[PDB]
Design a protein around this ligand. Structure first.
Ligand SMILES: Cc1cc2nc3c(=O)[nH]c(=O)nc-3n(C[C@H](O)[C@H](O)[C@H](O)COP(=O)(O)OP(=O)(O)OC[C@H]3O[C@@H](n4cnc5c(N)ncnc54)[C@H](O)[C@@H]3O)c2cc1C
Ligand SMILES: Cc1cc2nc3c(=O)[nH]c(=O)nc-3n(C[C@H](O)[C@H](O)[C@H](O)COP(=O)(O)OP(=O)(O)OC[C@H]3O[C@@H](n4cnc5c(N)ncnc54)[C@H](O)[C@@H]3O)c2cc1C
Ligand SMILES: NC(=O)C1=CN([C@@H]2O[C@H](COP(=O)(O)OP(=O)(O)OC[C@H]3O[C@@H](n4cnc5c(N)ncnc54)[C@H](OP(=O)(O)O)[C@@H]3O)[C@@H](O)[C@H]2O)C=CC1
Ligand SMILES: NC(=O)C1=CN([C@@H]2O[C@H](COP(=O)(O)OP(=O)(O)OC[C@H]3O[C@@H](n4cnc5c(N)ncnc54)[C@H](OP(=O)(O)O)[C@@H]3O)[C@@H](O)[C@H]2O)C=CC1
Ligand code: NA
Ligand code: NA
Ligand code: NA
Lengths: 490, 486
């Protein structure tokens, strides 16, 4: 038919948050739900598809890629333990990796497809959603608001969950640059590659490129200021920098690309603000991601943006427009998949359940799948020290015995616990080293339960592990007193 | 003769924690006794204990070395190419690297003694001469050349345990974990005997380093290995060791062993079956090392099971004599022995009478794949709580759809008291499980409920996030009866 369809809830963007939102509303609460996305499976032209950034061009494939990359390390380090093979025969075949990543991704797409053909009151619509009015979502053939209309969807409640998009700086020859999106689809691993940025994506990808580089290859990461990974634990920022360098990656600090042009042979000639130069085969910009509001036509209903660009929301995910809600990266609070998932469930429960619920944005466990990986939950010391007269820091940082054998002496495992010293409350835990992301999950539960240093300490360690460092620390290495760092209390 | 506040017999995980704590927190004058200064035959354990010498430390390295068999094969799926026929597992190298690491620990333990005041070390064999006197002789025999007479206000028994050997003909042609640590070469065919920690861990080790053509056989006298651990996990870990080429013989138990002309061993099981192997390793339990203490001179009391009797404070029936760690038979874990030592010295020379909590202790089996657990298994919970709920997730992580090890199901189980949602037990199988479970131990000391886990935000992608995404029970035990619904 040529008639519009009517829903309790339309969700725009079928990603981490939107999927959880939709599924919950239908299966839990018996609501009729519509979900809109631009593409049924991963890749060009739109990259994100059904399943979101996570599944298609994010969490899932990067983690498979980082996992592939860790074999570089494993193969070398096995020698310490008696493994002998022909080192000269060793090749890292990127196309195989990328083909296997694509098959895995596509299965997830296909199963999502399955589910929406199956579940009562959960319908999928292919196209570009925008807001026509308070209770009408329009689905057009492209982002152009003048493209043809495929559907009009009537909605009592509209959820906005279109996520984010890579930020590209406006510099000469920016068109010779890629983002993470294109990185996932490179026909060949680059011989020379520059990853611009000192954050999650740059540091994770550098690790990937570094393992898969052809012979004579070089990965370079540039960062515009002095120390990468602002927002993370200072000891950890400095350590991951040592460790990345130790594994063959050049970290250029205080350097920022000013322009890019093509050499005669087609490679990329980068000029930094400092005037320094660098030739690479690929320049990947990873300088941030921004909420995807531009195509929603929010102007039509009057949904307000933050000064920043995200949809403004209250703690309950509600926009200034009564029945229109936003979640996930589109709000630009915390950009994480399981955060987006939690926001979706809390929204749905609130709107369609009998009992309001808000997502807790503090104490969120999270990771960097760098080589080696970070795992963190809670406040860094310098932030705690601005909010508490007395702050204790417990630090353990040592090369693990397995790594005096493996030959990777530079692989210090770091475990840091941050306390309000007045009362023992654990404010933050920061880890670096193998297993950090896994160790950290349960630490999330601890912080929720208002854990204290003595709670960890009284817990009997599992031995031999890295994790047990968290449960053998009773004496602070240092303190901050009025925001002042000191070895001892006066 | 020489006088001391505390004499510690046994320089192991527990002994050392207690002695140091006694010297350096309480300023006491401490003597610690041990039979050997570094690792290996003929007494195997030494300064550092079983842990350091012939337990936790060296086996975790060895297991780590074993894991590479999987990584090497598994890299292929992610695009790694190399010549798989060039791949040799060099055991002599593994052993020499292991020996070197353990030697450095023995060395830095000597160092520690020379650098700490009120902490003295005595080489030799410790016996209780009388309520307040510890003699050190040259050998384990009570009539050997007395080396030292230590006068003691307090005596800590910290001698640990020893491999149990069954009384069967040809038992002298078997080895234990001790000798396993020192084999000149990796066995081609080997029988690990027993269904517990050590059998399972070593099986994993021999399976990786076995020369071309080899086979590891693990045998267990009953139907399913690893009694005492979660049931789904005993089944799965079985399946997964099988998938990695380990033959698991259930309901089988050696009745005798003999020497074959080639140096290998002929094993006859009770059932009548036979098997030829290069090495039979008995891993059928560990018993409290009591026999050389001459406990009869003081009359320190044993239990039926064989270990020194203590109260919750680690005190013997004899006033100033205490026992901690494996000798007491409570929980044979290194960090349990370290905590036991700590608590005892806080009761005695502190103002703070302290007792170790043996419930909710996280621990691991370093099997390939590994296990991690804290708290009750469901069959035990159902005997103690009217309503028990079980939340379960079990499936192959996506990385192992690509590695091609499709059989590495990751298992996460949460066992609650369904009445109030209290988490009673968590059980894990899969890479990371021993790391994942450490903080889970902390949770249980904060009366975490199933909803605390679920309402925590996951870290994605991890195996661990599985613990924070289980909302609905898979099944229930009502009054002891397993049912799907209520
Ligand atoms: C390379 C990379 C790696 C990452 N790794 C991790 C990680 O390891 N762990 C982690 O926790 N987070 C990771 N993230 C972040 C994580 O992916 C996001 O926080 C999460 O995807 C946000 O979920 P969401 O629902 O808000 O949006 P998304 O998952 O992005 O879903 C948005 C969906 O909306 C669609 N869409 C956009 N506009 C329209 C339109 N108008 N009409 C219809 N559909 C539209 C898009 O196609 C997309 O599918 C990573 C991100 C990137 C880029
Ligand atoms: C192969 C193996 C692997 C293991 N792996 C782990 C693991 O990964 N994690 C874990 O938590 N636990 C593990 N364990 C168990 C763990 O080692 C014990 O629970 C722990 O060592 C207990 O320590 P203890 O202080 O009670 O005595 P020990 O650590 O065993 O030390 C006792 C010391 O007493 C000495 N001694 C004995 N008699 C005398 C005497 N008469 N005079 C002087 N000295 C004497 C011995 O030489 C020994 O060094 C493992 C055990 C084995 C056998
Ligand atoms: N495993 C995980 O959890 C992952 C999470 N993510 C999520 O996606 C978000 C975005 O990832 P990402 O793109 O790496 O962004 P981030 O915001 O994490 O980091 C961006 C980096 O670019 C630098 N930068 C910012 N602006 C500029 C500029 N104009 N010119 C030059 N450099 C600049 C920043 O420096 P400065 O400090 O000076 O601002 C910072 O070093 C992440 O914050 C995270 O929330 C992404 C990948 C993996
Ligand atoms: N990583 C860690 O934390 C480790 C800790 N350890 C510690 O050391 C202790 C001892 O290790 P282990 O040697 O494996 O002993 P365990 O008690 O762990 O396992 C013993 C196995 O031997 C079987 N068995 C018992 N008696 C006999 C018998 N008479 N004849 C034949 N078989 C028998 C038992 O079967 P049944 O169930 O039927 O009684 C059981 O399956 C462990 O329990 C653990 O506490 C050891 C290694 C690693
Ligand atoms: Na502890
Ligand atoms: Na000394
Ligand atoms: Na959760």
């Amino acid at each position: 038919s040529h008639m519009s369809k009517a829903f309790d809830l339309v969700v725009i963007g079928a990603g981490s948050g939107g999927l959880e939102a939709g599924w919950n509303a239908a299966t839990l609460y018996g609501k009729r739900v519509a979900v809109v996305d631009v593409q049924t499976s991963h890749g060009p032209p739109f990259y994100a598809a059904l399943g979101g950034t996570c599944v298609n061009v994010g969490c899932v494939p990067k983690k498979l890629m980082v996992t592939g990359a860790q074999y570089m390390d494993h193969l070398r380090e096995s020698a310490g333990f008696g493994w002998e093979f022909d080192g000269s025969s060793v090749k890292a075949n990127w196309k195989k990796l990328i083909a296997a990543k694509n098959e895995a991704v596509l299965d997830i797409n296909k199963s999502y497809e399955g589910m929406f053909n199956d579940t009562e009151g959960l319908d999928f619509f292919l196209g570009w959603g925008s807001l026509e009015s308070k209770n009408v979502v329009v689905v057009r053939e492209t982002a152009d608001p003048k493209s043809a209309v495929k559907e009009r969807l009537q909605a009592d409640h509209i959820l906005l969950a279109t996520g984010s998009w890579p930020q590209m700086p406006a510099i000469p020859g920016i068109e010779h640059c890629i983002s993470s999106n294109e990185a996932f689809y490179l026909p060949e691993p680059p011989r020379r590659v520059l990853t611009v940025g000192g954050g999650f994506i740059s540091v994770e990808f550098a690790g990937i490129f570094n393992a898969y580089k052809p012979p004579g290859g070089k990965v370079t990461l540039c960062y515009r200021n002095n120390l990468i990974l602002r927002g993370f634990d200072e000891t950890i920022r400095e350590e991951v920098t040592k460790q990345l360098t130790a594994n063959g990656i050049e970290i250029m600090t205080n350097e920022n690309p000013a322009k890019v042009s093509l050499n005669t042979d087609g490679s990329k000639h980068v000029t930094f603000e400092s005037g320094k130069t660098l030739d690479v085969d690929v320049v990947m910009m990873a300088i941030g991601r921004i909420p995807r509001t531009n195509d929603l036509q929010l102007g039509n209903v009057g949904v307000k943006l933050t000064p920043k660009g995200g949809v403004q929301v209250d703690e309950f995910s509600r926009t200034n427009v009564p029945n229109i809600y936003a979640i996930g990266d589109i709000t630009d609070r915390l950009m994480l998949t399981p955060v987006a998932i939690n926001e979706g469930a809390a929204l749905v429960d609130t709107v369609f359940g009998n009992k309001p619920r808000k997502t807790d944005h503090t104490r969120v466990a999270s990771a960097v799948f760098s080589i080696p990986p970070i795992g963190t939950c809670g406040l860094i010391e310098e932030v705690a020290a601005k909010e508490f007269e007395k702050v204790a820091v417990y630090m353990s940082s040592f090369t693990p015995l397995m790594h005096n054998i493996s030959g990777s002496k530079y692989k210090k495992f770091v475990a840091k616990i941050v306390t309000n010293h007045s009362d023992g409350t654990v404010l933050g835990v920061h880890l670096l080293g193998d297993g950090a992301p896994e160790i950290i999950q349960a630490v999330g539960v601890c912080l929720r339960l208002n854990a204290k240093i003595s709670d960890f300490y009284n817990t009997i360690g599992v031995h031999p592990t890295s994790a047990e460092e968290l449960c053998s620390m009773r004496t602070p290495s240092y303190y901050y007193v009025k925001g002042e760092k000191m070895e001892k209390l006066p």
